[PDB]
Structure formats: C-alpha cells, structure tokens
Design a protein around this ligand. Structure first.
Ligand SMILES: [Mg+2]
Ligand SMILES: [Mg+2]
Ligand SMILES: [Mg+2]
Ligand SMILES: [Zn+2]
Lengths: 206, 148, 70, 97, 62, 127
RNA sequence: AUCUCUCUCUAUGCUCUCUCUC
C-alpha cells in the first residue's frame, strides 16, 4: 500500500501501511481487552512498540515499572539463571517464536492470549512470614496489582525454565504452551498450579 | 512409563489418611508425593506440620523420609492437595502406617507381572486390584481373604 | 528416547498422515507424539518441505515454525 | 535512693491496705500501685457502626458503651503498654497527659 | 466468589519485617464502606484491588 | 413484623461461642462453636474463625425463620478476665453483614461484688 | 473522650597497669 520511491532498496511490507499503522513487527497491538476491571497502567498495552527491546529507566521511580511493554517484561524475565544473564536479543527472539507458536495453535492475536494468561495466573490472596515470634504463622495478605502482575510473569517464566531443563522442547514452544494453559482450557500449567496452591494456602490461614 | 493410582477412583477424598515421602522444601511447606494415592503433588502449609513448636524442620519431617498425614483440601477438576500432618490423631497413626504398608505391598505385587509382560498398566490395574476394592474397600484385605 | 533415530517407511507414512489436523509441526512435537526422536526428525521435516505439504512461518533456524495447508 | 517522695504510691495516713489481682498477670498488687487506665469503649469498632445503622430494627438507637476499670499492675503495666518510663527529671508531673 | 475495591488512602506501612501496606479500601460497588485492609506490595491511590477475602480485616502486623 | 432471637456471644480470650437461644433462653436454635470451624488451635481466638462461625449461624437461622436478633455479649469474668476478648466484635460484624437485623446489642459480663481468690497465687502468672 | 493488640528460648568465659615539669 503506497510504494515510496527511494534509491535505496526497502522491503514491500515496510512500504505497505506499516508506515500508516505502527503496530508491532507485524502484529495487532489493538484489540485491548483486560478481563479484570481497569488494571491499565499496571499492564501497559496501548503504546504500539515495534520490537520488545527498549533501553529506558524503569527502576528510577516507584510505579514507572508499569510503563514497560508486557512483551518486553516477559523477555526480561526470560533473561535469567547464569547461562542467560544479559543476552536480551535471545530473549526477544524467543518471545517472537512464542508469539508465532501461539498464532499457529488455537489462532487469535497472541498478545491478548498473553494478557489473559497474566490475568488468570497471578494470585489475589498471598502469604507473608509475619512471624508471631518468628514461628510458622502467616497472615493472609491481599496483593497489590503491579506486584501481582510481576509475580505472575515471573512464575510463567519459571514454568518455561522448568520445562526446558533437559528436554527436546525448545524454550519458546514450551513457554507458549504453558501460557495457553494458563489463559484458559486445561489449567495444568506449572505456574498457574503454583499460584492456585498459594491462594489455597492463604485461604487456610489468617 | 509406570503410573496409575493406588485406589479405585482417580482423585483423593476429603479427610483421607495418607503417608507422604518428602521431596523438597520451598515456602508453603513441601511438594510431597502421596504414597496412599497415586503420585500427585500437594503441600503441607506451615501451620499444620507438627502439634508443638519444634524449631527444627529437618529432624521431625526430613527430606526423603515418610510422614503420617491427612488430606484437607481437594479440588476435583485438575489437581491440588492441601495437606496436614497435625490433624492426625494419637493412635490412628498406627492404623495409617499399616495402611501405607498394605499399599506398598499391593504396589510390589503389580510390577512383577508388568515386567514379565509389558502391555498397558491401566488395564492390568483394572483386571487385578479394582473390582475387589469396589466389593470391599482395600486390595490388601482382598489379598488376605484370598490367602485364607 | 529409546533410540528412534530411523527414517523408517512406516514411520514416514505415519508422519505424512499425522502432520495434518494438528496445526503446529516441529521436531519437538514429533518427539512428543512418539515417532522420531532427535536429529533425523529435522531431516524428515526438511524433506516434507519441497513443494507444499506443510507451509513455513519461520524465517529462522534451530527452532522450526510450520503450519499445514488449510 | 528513693525514686519518689511518694515512695510507692498513695499510702499516706493509711498503711497496709487492700490488695487487687491484676488483668493479665493476675498478681496481688496494692490498690495504689495498681495503675487504673479505665477503658471506655463502644461495643463495636469505629468503622463497624454505619453498617449496623443500615441493618437494624431499632433505627437511630445509638450505641452502648463498656466501662472497664483496668488494674494494670506496675510490672505488667509495661510490655508495649501504657505509662512507659519517664526521666528522673520529668517525673514530678501528675497531669493525665 | 469475586469482589474488588478501589484504594484511596494508605494508612501507613506495618509489619515486623515491614513492607506490607495498611490500606483504606473503598468499594466501587457501594461507596458507603471504607475498610482497613492488608496489602502486599507497591500500591498508590485510585487502584482496583481484587479481594478473595470478603469481610475479614486486620490492622497491625506482628 | 419481625421474629426476634437472642445471640449470646461467649467470645472469651481463648474460644468463641455464638450460642443463639430463644427469648427466655431455655431452648437453643443454633450454636456452632467458634473453634470448630477452624481446626487450628492458634486460630480459635482469631477474629476470622469467629466471623466464619457467625456466618454459619446466620445460614442456619436466617434461612429458617428468625430475621431479627438481640445480641448479648460476654467474654467470661467473675474471676477470669472481665474484659471482651478477640472474636466478639468480628462475630457481631458477621451477623450484621450476613443480612440479619439487629435488636439492641448489650454486654452481660459476670462482674462480681468481690469474688473468691482467683488463680495466679499472689506473685501471679509469669510470662 | 478515640485507645486499638501482641508474642518465646538464650548457658558460661580466667590474660595485669601508667604519670610529669610551674
Ligand atoms: Mg492516721
Ligand atoms: Mg489456674
Ligand atoms: Mg503452678
Ligand atoms: Zn499486671
């Protein structure tokens, strides 16, 4: 759509309405459906980042961490454990692969699926070692939104990590699968299970 | 792969007495394997592990070892076990131990056959242990009866 | 995996009839659904992709992203 | 030395009076060293009144209040409790604050 | 059962270890209730806070 | 207009009772002991347990006939504590917010005109 | 008249000593 005439060679896709609509590396950053009420500026969406790799300041204020794209945050979380500290390019690649897998399996815009997974993993009721003398007493504490989101993301990544530790399954595919499980259908994913267990524990305590 | 549950039905019941072999300690308690019901993962939340404050965790519970336990919360949909060690009454403990032993014996019986001939394990379980259980309660009792 | 690194004729046939219906096709997937385990799976995948059969999504190696024709 | 000109508490032109058992430790303590905070508190919480007003038979009945004279003895008058410890300089102040 | 309430003011931060926030929760379904709630983690004003707990409340954490 | 019950909350320093009686008190409707609901003995004086018990009582009673309730409250005394312990207020809250109408709250703690020598033994209990 | 309300074990330890000039 509308080829721009240059002396330098530019691909057809770039020429097409990607100049017009600025959504992702060829994915929909629209749709915009958060299942829980509001939750925006805690799960970012909105800002149509092209590739989940932005170098900015997201530790230098209290809540500014929220303005990280969710995909980017996922990538960052993936970037973990010795063999992979730094190497964000790899993480980005893995995320792309995951997205592709999601697209292939049960269709849909993968971003929405990711969002769903984030929503449906994370816990409402949590436990803190309050003490009561330092002993095994844990009062049930409800979780703040941003923190909860972060926790969910971490557990998702953890699931993938667990899956990959000596297996044929490349990280990305496994991650995608677990994300899908988390979203809705089976709920036999690791992260979601863990979250549910935590919630149960919180319920049985005060 | 070798699997399949100890009893007749797939999922554990509320207030079922179990014996738990300790795998690893995390935050809630331990992700233990229930040796009275399949190998489904569950946890003892840090409040119901012992009757009194005993400070030490790796002497009264111990990683690798078995603990006399009871199932508190069960969710018949996917797979969660909220478990207790404290709610097991005095005595009762002996009974639980006996049950565990029986279960172990039953398990021992059902593997030799498999080894001798492969073939699906579920089918084997169906044709050896379950009908008797349904008739009475436990497979070891049935075995005892047979012996008699 | 208990060997299973053979481009067997029967195995090939199975692959041909099991790669459709399922949307996602990969080496890992193949390993999961019990046919070929490892290096020759990749080869099989490659030789399924000459003209048609399974359409590519991936423009990247090491991880394969392939969808059957609808 | 004597910490107080009142030595203990209050026993002047009196002597060897009558004992009270405490709140928490329940110990025998004279009715002067006794320490009496006196608790006036409405039966419910400060935030648990509106709800009651909403759901009741007797509309605009107001509140009953508990009047409990505590005998929080010197010893267990202090854990994170009342009365604290005052400076040997600023101990000669009998005011309620 | 599912409930959710917006936060409006923070009643400081309490805990032996600390970190855990005491919040004043106002329900977006009927604004007549402002309850003292235990919240774990970073929380400001005007945030939707999901609650699995319906009615139980605690102040100090010890 | 309304059927009136009597709550009689015994939320002593250890365990709660929501022993809902008639109006003369001779015949009980439903009791559900506060420490029954949670089988953790640490969580018996806990407000949560009390609240749960109250909710259970409401379920038993509100969905059978009795809509209005006078609330008597006593956390022991005479020789014990003479002070409302943890669990009474919570129970009351639960009663209110389950949906039951309130027919005047009142405290009937047993307060002596000086009693027998209570436990401790002069020097008292040592923490 | 606005408090709100927290929590338990923990035993002992032997190796010196110092002034000036007005
Ligand atoms: Mg005289
Ligand atoms: Mg006694
Ligand atoms: Mg004694
Ligand atoms: Zn005292």
């Amino acid at each position: 759509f509308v080829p721009v005439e240059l002396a330098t060679t530019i691909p057809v896709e770039i020429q097409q309405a990607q100049q017009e609509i600025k959504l992702f590396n060829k994915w929909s950053f629209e749709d915009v459906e958060v299942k829980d009420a509001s939750l925006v500026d805690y799960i970012q969406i909105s800002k149509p980042i092209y590739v989940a790799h932005t170098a900015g300041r997201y530790a230098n204020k209290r809540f500014r961490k929220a303005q990280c794209p969710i995909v980017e945050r996922l990538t960052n979380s993936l970037m973990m454990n010795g063999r992979n500290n730094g190497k964000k390019l790899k993480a980005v690649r893995i995320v792309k692969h995951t997205l592709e897998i999601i697209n292939v399996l049960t269709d849909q815009n993968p971003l929405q699926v990711v969002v769903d997974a984030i929503i449906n993993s994370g816990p409402r009721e949590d436990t803190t070692r309050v003490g009561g003398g330092g002993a095994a007493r844990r009062q049930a504490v409800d979780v703040s939104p941003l923190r909860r989101v972060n926790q969910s993301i971490a557990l998702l990544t953890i699931g993938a990590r667990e899956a990959a530790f000596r297996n044929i399954k490349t990280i990305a595919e496994t991650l995608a699968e677990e994300l899908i499980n988390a979203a809705k259908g089976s709920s036999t994913s690791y992260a979601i299970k863990k979250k549910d267990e935590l919630e149960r524990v919180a319920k049985s305590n005060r | 792969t070798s699997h399949c549950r100890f009893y007749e039905n797939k999922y554990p019941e509320i207030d079922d007495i179990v014996m738990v072999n300790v795998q690893q300690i995390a935050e809630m308690g331990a992700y233990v394997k229930l040796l009275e019901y399949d190998n489904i993962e569950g946890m003892i939340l840090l409040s119901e592990l012992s009757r009194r404050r005993i400070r030490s965790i790796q002497k009264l519970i111990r990683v690798g070892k078995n603990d006399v336990a009871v199932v508190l919360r069960v969710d018949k949909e996917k797979g969660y076990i909220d478990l207790s060690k404290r709610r097991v009454s005095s005595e009762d403990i002996i009974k639980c131990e006996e049950k565990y032993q029986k279960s172990k014996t039953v398990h021992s019986i059902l593997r030799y056959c498999a080894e001798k001939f492969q073939i699906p394990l579920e089918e084997l379980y169906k044709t050896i242990a379950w009908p008797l259980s349904r008739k009475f309660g436990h497979a070891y009792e049935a075995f005892k009866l047979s012996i008699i | 995996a208990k060997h299973a690194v053979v481009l067997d004729q029967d195995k090939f046939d199975r692959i041909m009839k099991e790669a459709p219906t399922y949307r996602y096709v990969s080496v890992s997937v193949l390993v999961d659904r019990f046919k070929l385990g490892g290096s020759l799976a990749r080869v099989a995948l490659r030789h399924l992709e000459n003209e048609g059969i399974i359409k590519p999504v991936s423009k990247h190696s090491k991880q394969a992203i392939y969808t059957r024709a609808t | 030395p004597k910490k107080r000109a009142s030595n203990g508490r209050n026993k002047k032109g009196r002597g060897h009076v009558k004992p009270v058992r405490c709140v928490n430790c329940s110990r025998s303590v004279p009715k002067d060293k006794a320490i009496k905070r006196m608790a006036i508190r409405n039966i419910v919480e400060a935030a648990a009144i509106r709800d009651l007003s909403e759901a009741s038979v007797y509309a605009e009945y107001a509140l009953p209040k508990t009047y409990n004279k505590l005998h929080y003895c010197i010893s267990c008058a202090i854990h994170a409790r009342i009365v604290r410890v005052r400076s040997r300089t600023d101990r000669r102040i009998r005011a309620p604050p | 059962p599912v409930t959710l309430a917006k936060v409006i003011k923070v009643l400081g931060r309490t805990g032996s270890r600390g970190g855990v926030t005491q919040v004043r929760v106002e329900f977006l379904e009927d604004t007549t209730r402002t309850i003292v709630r235990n919240v774990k983690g970073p929380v400001r004003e005007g945030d939707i806070l999901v609650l699995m707990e319906s009615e139980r409340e605690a102040r100090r954490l010890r | 207009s309304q059927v009136f019950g009597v709550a009689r909350i015994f939320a002593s320093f250890n365990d709660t009772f929501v022993h809902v009686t008639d109006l003369s008190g001779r015949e009980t409707i439903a009791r559900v002991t506060g420490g029954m609901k949670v089988k953790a003995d640490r969580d018996e004086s806990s407000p949560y347990a009390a609240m749960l018990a109250a909710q259970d009582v409401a379920a038993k009673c509100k969905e059978v006939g009795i809509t209005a309730v006078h609330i008597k409250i006593r956390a022991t005394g005479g020789t014990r504590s003479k002070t409302p312990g943890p669990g009474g207020q919570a129970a009351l809250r639960a009663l209110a917010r389950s949906g039951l109408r309130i027919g005047r709250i009142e405290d009937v703690t047993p307060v002596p005109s000086d009693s027998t020598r209570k436990k401790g033994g002069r020097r008292g209990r040592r923490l």
